[PDB]
Amino acid sequence: MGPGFDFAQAIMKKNTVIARTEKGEFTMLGVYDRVAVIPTHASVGEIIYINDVETRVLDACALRDLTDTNLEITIVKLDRNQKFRDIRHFLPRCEDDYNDAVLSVHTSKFPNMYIPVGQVTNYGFLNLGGTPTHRILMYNFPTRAGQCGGVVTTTGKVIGIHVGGNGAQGFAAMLLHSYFTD
């Protein structure tokens, strides 16, 4: 409808796949080469389905901060025959608050879904499903089941991936440029 949705659509069309684990179907953001991200609660194993194709996982790392606190981001390297467009220059360098964000989802259940979530707060600490979690972003939308892994963008930045909600608020794990230096 406007330039927020335009940036979100550009990311979804080239940089997302549908990931399936034993814990469900997730929106999965491809960042560069064969490297993608997914919520840690997807419990990625040795094999994952990518757009319904059996795919070997070459590496999977559940990120934690230097206090050994969960960040809820898993970085996955996929044994895929094709690279993602490199979008690392759209990742923030620092923790921040944002205006006018869009949450975008692409699954069998929710195809081509875009939600204008508005203002995004650097919330910080969240007890997420009983697990102490850091670097949480918060937005005021009744976010449901089937949204996990959804991409949070502003015009020009890819800032997080949806990891939960409490019925009134939704929560995303930050993406930072420093996670994807090689």
Swiss-Prot record:
Q: Show where the Peptidase C3 domain sits.
A: 2-180
Catalytically driven reaction(s): Selective cleavage of Gln-|-Gly bond in the poliovirus polyprotein. In other picornavirus reactions Glu may be substituted for Gln, and Ser or Thr for Gly
Q: Where is the active site?
A: 41, 72, 148
Location of this chain's protein in the cell: Host cytoplasm
What is the role of this chain? Major viral protease that mediates proteolytic processing of the polyprotein. Cleaves host EIF5B, contributing to host translation shutoff. Also cleaves host PABPC1, contributing to host translation shutoff. Binds and inhibits host IFIH1/MDA5, thereby inhibiting the type-I IFN production and the establishment of the antiviral state. Cleaves host MAP3K7/TAK1, resulting in inhibition of TRAF6-triggered NF-kappa-B induction. Cleaves host TICAM1; this interaction allows the virus to disrupt host TLR3 signaling. Cleaves host IRF7, resulting in inhibition of type-I IFN production.
Quaternary organization = Interacts with host IFIH1/MDA5; this interaction inhibits host IFIH1.
Entry protein name:
Protease 3C
Q: What is the lineage of its organism?
A: Viruses, Riboviria, Orthornavirae, Pisuviricota, Pisoniviricetes
- Which residues of the whole protein are included? 1549 to 1729 of 2188
